[model samples]
Target: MQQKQQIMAALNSQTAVQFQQYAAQQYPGNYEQQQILIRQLQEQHYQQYMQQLYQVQLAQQQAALQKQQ
Candidate 1:
């Protein structure tokens, strides 16, 4: 059961993978030095993208409604 939990944690750890990918990038813009910050910024960008996607979907839904009416 503990091993199953550990496997679940590893599978669900996007932050860990993000940091690993950031380290792999070795960005010259101080990103490697600020690994934690990099992850936070990436999270922020992801949130922004989600917001954009929601807006786009809402617009499309509205258009579909108008078309049906």
Candidate 2:
């Protein structure tokens, strides 16, 4: 769990930095538009992460059930 938290923090920070850079380059002086784009990217990022995490948890549960049998 601790390792997973660290992994998530690292991913969050890395994605934020990359998105910031990309947004800056793409929108130059338009701060509002940059934020809007980054917000959308962030939403997509978390949704994808949640789906992957759910799949991992489901797989673990299945493995545990198999082990019980």
Candidate 3:
């Protein structure tokens, strides 16, 4: 669990920086609004990460089942 937490935290910070740059370029001179959009972008990224993780887990499970058959 600790390792998983570390991975998530790392992903979060990396995505934050990228999103900050994106927000600055896309909507300049709007500090507060940038923060809001950055949070939303981070949330979306986290959701996508979880979805991909789940899909991989599902694939592995199915592969294991097929191997037993």
Global lDDT scores for all candidate models: 0.63, 0.81, 0.83
Task: List the candidate 1 regions with Cα displacement exceeding 4 Å.
Answer: 1-31, 67-69
How many pairs of residues collide in each model? 0, 0, 0
| Model 2 TM-score on a 0 to 1 scale | 0.63
TM-score each candidate.
Answer: 0.43, 0.63, 0.67
- Top candidate on TM-score is 3
lDDT of 2 by residue, 1-69 (tens): 356556556666778878988999989999899888887887778778889999999999999889656
Superposition error at 19 for model 3 (Å): 0.7
- Give the runs in model 2 whose Cα sits over 4 Å from its true position: 1-14, 67-69
User: Candidate 3: which stretches are off by over 4 Å?
Assistant: 1-8, 66-69
* Candidate 1, pairs of clashing residues: none
Give the least accurate 10-residue stretch of model 1, judged by summed lDDT.
3-12
The full ranking of all candidates by TM-score, starting with the best, is: 3, 2, 1
